[PDB]
Amino acid sequence: EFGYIYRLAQDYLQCVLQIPQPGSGPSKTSRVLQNVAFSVQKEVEKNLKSCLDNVNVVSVDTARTLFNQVMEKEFEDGIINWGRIVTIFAFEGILIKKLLRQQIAPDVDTYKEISYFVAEFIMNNTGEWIRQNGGWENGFVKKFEPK
Ligand SMILES: *CCC(=O)N(c1ccc(O[C@@H]2CC[C@@H](N)C2)cc1)[C@@H](C)c1ccc(C(F)(F)F)c(C#N)c1
């Protein structure tokens, strides 16, 4: 459900921003996701450096527009797979790093807005495929957890 996906998206943004939230800590799914998505994010940052250096992410609306353009390109052939879902989180990590650095009126309460639209996209466009492929615990974690 939305709340579950929003918590994954929020946890990943907090991981990239170096602000882990105090308390019981991230779930097993979140821990596995942070590891795989961060690895994909680092690869994307290097491989698409010229492409990422040409944008100025001055606002949440600018980040939303950029994210939608990436999603149209990522899923243009209509196929969904777990590697593509991990790539969504990798792009939200890149967007929050650019927003911290380039946002016009830096607003600490706008990192949750990026997490929100990423969760809306995941739920609306990939949610049914995720559920049919086992959800996060029986699908995602089984595929990507350490061997
Ligand atoms: C380089 C083209 C470009 O400026 N661009 C863009 C980046 C990435 C894709 O598609 C991904 C790579 C190929 C597929 N696997 C998906 C498409 C277009 C823009 C729209 C862009 C630049 C920078 C960012 C950044 F992350 F830095 F904020 C985004 C985003 N989000 C998009």
UniProtKB/Swiss-Prot annotation:
Seems to be restricted to the hematopoietic compartment. Expressed in peripheral blood, spleen, and bone marrow, at moderate levels in lung, small intestine and testis, at a minimal levels in other tissues. Also found in vascular smooth muscle cells and hematopoietic malignancies. It comes from the Eukaryota. One of its GO terms (cellular component) is cytosol. A motif (BH2) lies at residues 128-143. Coiled coil: none annotated. One of its GO terms (biological process) is positive regulation of apoptotic process. The keyword Transcription does not apply. Induction: By phorbol ester and inflammatory cytokines, such as TNF or IL1B/interleukin-1 beta, but not by growth factors. It is found in: Cytoplasm. Keywords: Apoptosis, Cytoplasm. GO terms for molecular function: channel activity. A motif (BH1) lies at residues 73-93. Belongs to the Bcl-2 family. Interacts directly with BAK1, BID, BMF and BBC3. Interacts directly with BCL2L11/BIM. Interacts with BAX isoform Sigma. Interacts directly with PMAIP1. Interacts with RTL10/BOP. Interacts with ING4. Interacts with UBQLN4. Retards apoptosis induced by IL-3 deprivation. May function in the response of hemopoietic cells to external signals and in maintaining endothelial survival during infection. Can inhibit apoptosis induced by serum starvation in the mammary epithelial cell line HC11. This is Bcl-2-related protein A1. It comes from Homo sapiens. The lineage of its organism: Eukaryota, Metazoa, Chordata, Craniata, Vertebrata.
